[PDB]
Paper text:
pmcThe mature HIV-1 capsid is a conical, fullerene shell that encompasses the viral genome. It is constructed of a lattice of approximately 200 capsid protein (CA) hexamers incorporating CA pentamers at 12 highly curved vertices. Here, we present structures at 2.6 to 3.5 Å resolution of CA hexamers and pentamers within in vitro assembled conical CA-IP6 polyhedra from multiple lattice contexts differing in local curvature and geometry, alone or in the presence of Nup153-, CPSF6-, or Sec24C-derived peptides.
To investigate what effect the hexamer–pentamer switch and the tilt switch have on host–protein binding, we next repeated our structural analysis on cores incubated with FG repeat containing peptides Nup153(1407-1429), CPSF6(276-290), and Sec24C(228-242). Within all three hexamer reconstructions, we observe unambiguous density for the corresponding peptides, which adopt structures essentially identical to previously reported crystal structures. In contrast, in the average Nup153(1407-1429)-bound capsid, the switch is in the high-tilt conformation with R143 positioned below the helix 8/9 loop, Q176 pointing upward and the shift in the backbone position at E175-Q176. We did however, detect an increase in relative Nup153 peptide density at higher tilt angles, suggesting increased peptide occupancy. We posit that the increase in observed Nup153(1407-1429) occupancy at higher tilts correlates with the arrangement of the R143/Q176 tilt switch in the apo form, because the high-tilt conformation is favorable for Nup153(1407-1429) binding. The second switch regulates Nup153 affinity to the hexamer in a manner that is sensitive to local capsid curvature. It would allow Nup153 to preferentially bind to the more curved regions of the core, which are localized toward the ends of the cone.
Residue numbers in the entry:
A (entry chain A), C (entry chain A), E (entry chain A), G (entry chain A), I (entry chain A), J (entry chain A): 1 to 87, 96 to 221
B (entry chain B), D (entry chain B), F (entry chain B), H (entry chain B), K (entry chain B), L (entry chain B): 1410 to 1420
C-alpha cells in the first residue's frame, strides 16, 4: 500500500506477512473457486504493482494457472501500449505491470495530481486473467448440474448458482439459464412443483415451494 | 470474455 | 471503514484480512443460524458499500442464499428509487448498493454535512435480506419443537428459543408462543410442573421448577 | 416480513 | 468503546472481531461457569450499550439463558424507570439498555460533564443477569460436594470452592459453609486430620495437613 | 439475589 | 495499564483479550509450575489493581489455590493497614487490593507526584501468595528427587533444579542442597564420577563429566 | 516464607 | 526495518516475532521450492543487513543450503570489494553483508543523501544465493517431467511449469522448452490434440483443448 | 524495550505476551538447537535487563541449563566488576544483570549521553552462556557424523553442518573440518566422487557432484 | 547463473 | 570458549 510519512512524503507500506499468508492460503486451498477473485481484490486494496506482483509471485502451486495469468497480463500490457502511444513520464504497459517501473515510479504515479492509478489498472488486468482461470477451473458445465433423485432442492440450487458464478456468462445468458435450466434440470418432483409457480417466480419462492420435497 | 465473479457491487 | 487522514481528508480504510476471514468462517460454519446477522453487523461497523460488497462477494458457499440476498438488495434498491425520485448528487438505490457509485462517492456521501449514510442504508438492506435467509434456513417450525421423554427442560428451552429466534415472528406472536407452546410441547412431567406455576411464570421460574425433572 | 434476530438492543 | 478523534470529537471505536470471537468462544465453551462473568467484564471495558448488545446478540447457543438475561435486563430497566421519573436528555431504562437510544446518544451521555455512564449502568444489569444464570447453571448444590474415598483433598477443595463460587451465597453464608461443610463433607481420613487443626485453621493449613492423605 | 463471582476486587 | 490521553489526562488502557487469554491458558495448563509467576509478572506490567483483579478473577479452575491467594492478599492488606495507620487520600490495604478503590482512584495514586504505586504494591502481594501456592503444588520434596539406574544425569539435573525452584528454600539452603543432595542422590555411576571432581565443581563441569554415563 | 521463583534479576 | 523517530532521527524497527516465525515456517516447510524467494523478498521489505542476517540466522534446518548461501554472499561481497576500491565512509562488502558494520552504520548509509541502500544490495546477494539453492533443490530435470497415461494435462502442466520455475533457465530457453518439451512430453492423446493446434497456441488454448482428455 | 513518551520522557515498553509466548515455545520445542540463540537475539531487540530477565525467568523447563546460564551470567558480572572498579552512577555487574538495578536505572543508563547500553552488555553475557549450553546439548561430535551406505549426501551435509554449527569450533578448525572430515566421513561412493574434485572444491560443487549418488 | 523465480514484475 | 552460532553477520 501507500502511506503518507510524518515528513509529508508519499511512502510505501509493505503488504503484511499475515496478508500474504492469507492470500497464499486462499490460492492453495480454494483452487480458483470464484470467491478467490473477491478475496484477491480485498487483500490488495491500495496495492502498488510491486505489492500485486508480490502476491502473484508468492503463489507456489498452480503454476500453469500463473502462466495463463502472466500471458493475460502481457496481452493487457500490449493492448495498453497500443491504446496509449508514447510521447512525470507516462507509464508503459510494462511499467503498470511493474516489470520496467521502480516502486518509486509506481508511488509517483499513484500519488500524482491527477493520479495515474497504475495499481488499479494492473489489478484490473490481474482480475481479468483470474476470470479466465476461474472459468477454466470450473469443474462442470451449467448444463451438467442436475438434481439427484433424493437431493434437496437447496443443495441443487447451491450447486447451480456456484457453477453459474464460475462459468460467468453474460447477465442475459444467466437470466435465461436461471429461468430455463434451473427448472428443467430439477428432479421430477421439484420440476413439477416449480412449473406450477409460473415463469415469474423468484428464487426465494422456488426454494420455499420445494423446501419440503 | 467472462463477466467476472462479483455478485455484489460494481465488479 | 472511513478514517480521517493526517491531511484532514476523508479516507478509506480497507476491511482487514482478519475481519474478512472471520466473516468467511462465520458464514461457512454457522450456515445462517441467527447469530450470523449480529456477527455480520458487528464485523461491518462503519463499512462503506464497497466494504459491504467485499464481505458479500467473499462468501464462496451458499450461492442460492447469496442470490436471494442479491434479489432482496435489488428490490430494496428499487423501493428506494421509488420513494426518492431523482431531481453532492443524491444517491440512487444502485449507488447505495455500491453498483453505480465509486468508493469516492460513497465516502463523499458518508462524510457529507449532514451525512447521507449510504453504508448504513445498504447494511439495512443486507440485514433485511439475511433475515429472510435465516428464516428460510431454520430447520424446524416452532410447532415441531417438542420435548423428549427424558430430555432436560433446559435443552428443550434452548431448542425452543433458538427456533423462535430463527423463525422471528412478531413479538406478540412470540409472546403467545412462549406462553402457550412452550408449556404445551413440554413432556408430561415438565408440562405438569409448568401448569402448576400459573400463566404469569417467568422463564427463570419455569426453568427452576423443571430443573430436577 | 421477519422481525430480525437481535434479541438485545435496537435491532 | 469510545475514543477521542483527531478533530477532538467523541467517537465510537467498534468492538474488534477478535474480542467478539473471544467472547463467543467463552460463552460457547465455558457454558456459564462463573469465570464467564469476569471474562465478560474484561472483554467489555469501556463498552457502549451498543457494544454490550453486540456481545449479547452474537451468542448463538444458550438461547434460554439469553432469554433469562433479557428478562433480567427488562426488569432492571423498569426499575430504573421507576427510580428515575422522567422530567442532553435524561436516559430512560430502554435508552441505557440501548433499545431506544442511538449510538450517538449513548456517546453523548458517556462523555457528558458529568458523564452519565449508561454503558456501565447497563453492564451492571447484564452482570446482574449473568449472576442468576451462573447460579442456575451450577450443576451441584454445595451440600452435594463430598470427597471420594480415595480423592485428593486438593481436588475436593477445588470442587468445593468452584461450587461455592457458582452458588454465590452471601459472605456470611460462605463463611459458615467453608467452616462447617468443607470439614463435614471431607472423607473420614481428611475429616479426622482437619478436626485436629481446630476451628481457626486457614485453607492453606487444611490443605497442607491433608496433602499426604 | 446472588452476590456475584468476583473473588477479587470490588465486584 | 495506564496511558496518557491526547488531552494529557492519565487514562486507563484495558488489559487486552489476548493478554487475558494468555494468562488463562498459563494458569489452566501449567498448574502453578514456578514459571507461572514470571509469566504473571510479565503479563501484568504496569497493571492497575483493577487489571490485576481482572487477571485473578478470570481464572476458572484451581479455586482452592485462588482462595489461598485471596487469604494471602487479605493478610497482606491487613499488614499494610497495620504498618500504615490512617491520618489525594492515602490508600488503605483494601484500596491497594482494589476492593474499596475505584479505577479512577487507582490511576490517581499511580500517577501522583511522587506516585503511590498501588498496582506494584498489590502485585507484590499477589506474587507473594503465588509463591506459597507454587511451593504447595510442588509434587515432590527435593529429598525425593533421585536419579534412576539408567536415567541421564541431565534429566535428573532438570528434575532436581525444577524441584529446587518450586520448593524455593533460601539461597544458603539451595547452596547446601546443590552441593550435597545433587551428588548424594545421583545414581552410583554418576555419584562416583561427581565425587572425583571435588566440592568446587560447577554444574557445567558436573554435567560435562556425567554426559557419557 | 518462600524466596520466590525468579532465577534471574531482582525477584 | 527503518522508521523515523518522533524526534526526527532515523531509527531501527526490529523485524517482528511473527514475521520471523513466518520466515522460519516458510523455510522449514517449503524446503526451497521457488516460492521461498518471493516470500523472503516480501518478508524482508525495507530490511537492514542486520534484519536480513537475523532472518538467515534463525533458520535451524538446511545448514548445507545455508552454507552455500554464506559462500555466495562471501563471493558477492568479494566482487563488490573488487568493483568498488576503497578510497560517511563507503561500505565494504563485509559492511553490506553486515559482518563489519554496526546497525547504526547500516541506518546511516540507508538514510544518507543520496542513500547507499546496503539492505537492498545485500538482499540482492541473498536472493542470488537462494536462486542457486532453489535450482539445486529442484527434484527433477524439466526433461524428466512427462505426462502419465491417465494424468490430467492440467496436473502435468502444473508439474512442468513448477519444474521450469525451479530450474530457472533463461527466457529464450524457457520459450524453447514450453514450445517443444511441453508438447513432446505430453501423453499420446494430449500430444495428438496439441499438435493439431499448431505452434502458435497459447497455454490457455492448449489447456482448453486438452481439458477433456 | 524503551520508547519515547509523548511528554518526551524515556519510557519502558513491556515485552509483549506474544513475544514471550514465542520465546517460551522456542526454548521448549527446540531444546538448545543453535537457532535458539539467533531467535533469542531477535526476540530481545532493544530489551532492558528487566526484559531479558523476564525472558529467562519465563522458561519453565531445562532448569539445569538455566542454572548453567545463571552461573555464566554471574561470572561475567564478576568479570565486569573486576574490569570496571567502582569510583548517573556507574553500573556494577549485578546492575547490568538487573539484580541490583531498578528498571528506571536501566532506562537511565540506556538513554544516557553517551548511553551505557546495559541491555546489550547483559544480552552479550546471556548469549555467551547460551553458547556453552548449545555446545553441551549438541547430541554428537562432528567426528561421529558419518554418511550412511544409502544416505543422500545432502542429508549428510545437513547433519554435518548442523553439528558443526552446534559444536562451534573456531573458524580455522571449522575450515579444517569441512576440508577434511566432510570428505573423510562420506560413504565410499561419495568419498570417491569428492576426492576427484580436488581440495579447492566448494560445497555447492561437492553437493552437485554427489547429487545423483 | 539462474534467472530467478519471480514470474511477475522486475525480479 | 565457543565461537557462537551466528552463521551470518557480526555474531
Amino acid at each position: 500500500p501507500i502511506v503518507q510519512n510524518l515528513q509529508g512524503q508519499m511512502v510505501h507500506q509493505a503488504i503484511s506477512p499475515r496478508t500474504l499468508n492469507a492470500w497464499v492460503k486462499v490460492v492453495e486451498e480454494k483452487a480458483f473457486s470464484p470467491e478467490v477473485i473477491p478475496m484477491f481484490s480485498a487483500l490488495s486494496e491500495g496495492a502498488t504493482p510491486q505489492d500485486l506482483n508480490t502476491m502473484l509471485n508468492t503463489v507456489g502451486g498452480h503454476q500453469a494457472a500463473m502462466q495463463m495469468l502472466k500471458e493475460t497480463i502481457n496481452e493487457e500490457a500490449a493492448e495498453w501500449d497500443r491504446l496509449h502511444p508514447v510521447h512525470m513520464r507516462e507509464p508503459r504497459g510494462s511499467d503498470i505491470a511493474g516489470t520496467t517501473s521502480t516502486l518509486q515510479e509506481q508511488i509517483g504515479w499513484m500519488t500524482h495530481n491527477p493520479p495515474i492509478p497504475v495499481g488499479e489498472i494492473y489489478k484490473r488486468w490481474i482480475i481479468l486473467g483470474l476470470n479466465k482461470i476461474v472459468r477454466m477451473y470450473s469443474p462442470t458445465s451449467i448444463l451438467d448440474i442436475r438434481q439427484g433423485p433424493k437431493e434437496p432442492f437447496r443443495d441443487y440450487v447451491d450447486r447451480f448458482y456456484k457453477t453459474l458464478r464460475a462459468e460467468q456468462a453474460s447477465q442475459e445468458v444467466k437470466n435465461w439459464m436461471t429461468e430455463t435450466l434451473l427448472v428443467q434440470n430439477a428432479n421430477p418432483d421439484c420440476k413439477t412443483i416449480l412449473k406450477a409457480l409460473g415463469p415469474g417466480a423468484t428464487l426465494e419462492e422456488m426454494m420455499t415451494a420445494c423446501q419440503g420435497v | 470474455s467472462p463477466s467476472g465473479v462479483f455478485t455484489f457491487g460494481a465488479n
